Amino acid sequence: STGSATTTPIDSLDDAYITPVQIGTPAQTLNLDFDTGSSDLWVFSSETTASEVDGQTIYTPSKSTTAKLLSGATWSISYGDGSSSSGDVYTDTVSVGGLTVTGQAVESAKKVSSSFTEDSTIDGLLGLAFSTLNTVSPTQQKTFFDNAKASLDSPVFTADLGYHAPGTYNFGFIDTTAYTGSITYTAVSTKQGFWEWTSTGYAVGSGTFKSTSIDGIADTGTTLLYLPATVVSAYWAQVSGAKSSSSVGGYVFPCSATLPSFTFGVGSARIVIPGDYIDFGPISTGSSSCFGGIQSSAGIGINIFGDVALKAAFVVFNGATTPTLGFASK
């Protein structure tokens, strides 16, 4: 089997991407944030504290003839950005782009933090990291991909995120029309439960490539590119007037600037992030100070190849017995 679904930016800045997901019988379609940095499929629901729901579409398990309470199971998750959610668990039929999993754990939120409530466009998350990170207790549950894998034509999924435009998540096949050149594959460590890999270096603009190992995670659920302070300083030094602002929470730059590109290495291959992908717009409405899309990972504890990086590539998440990651230009 295969599946193919379009993923759409939630706003004009590509702050996140949503993908429609069918849950239950009859189907209830919710727009979920596919997140290769976590491993829970959780949804706003009829059980979510009413004051914490503000415009989201909810899953109502009592209206699904295939929903079953997973007795005694609870979940609770905290994300890198300080947000969180928790609740109980159902199993139900879940379909993405024509690919159906029966008995998928659907984690129903009883509580969500303010950032979730405040984002009306995201109805929940669909985790695509390794199932070892799944938070369901006392019996850990499998991700949608893990459940689908054996049925897939090939045990892979691909992320093809658009810049200010829709893109695609495919399951079970590689669309050879969706990228240019070849796909370069690189080793993955699953030790921390992430799609963790080592970039071979970087360049800023038309500058020379610096060969240096940068361990980080391919994370569709993180907006920005978070890299070591040395790398980030080298990038922003090429933008007149750019500075790190403690009050704002990172590097800012004059909105009048033209940003240089940023290149990262994948083995001997190179992925080029155009300068415009690095512009996250005014820090506040009407400001001429703009927020940068490349930020320091210092104090995160890990480097994160978030959407800013991934959307410059066609990315293969290869879930073979020994997982790997593939990157192609597009």
From Swiss-Prot:
It catalyses: Hydrolysis of proteins with specificity similar to that of pepsin A, prefers hydrophobic residues at P1 and P1', but does not cleave 14-Ala-|-Leu-15 in the B chain of insulin or Z-Glu-Tyr. Clots milk. It is an enzyme of class 3 (hydrolase). Residues 17-328 form the Peptidase A1 domain. One of its GO terms (molecular function) is aspartic-type endopeptidase activity. The keyword DNA repair does not apply. Keywords: Aspartyl protease, Disulfide bond, Hydrolase, Protease, Signal, Zymogen. One of its GO terms (biological process) is proteolysis. Disulfide bonds join C255-C290. Its EC number is 3.4.23.22. The active site is at D35, S199. Belongs to the peptidase A1 family. This is Endothiapepsin. The gene is EAPA.
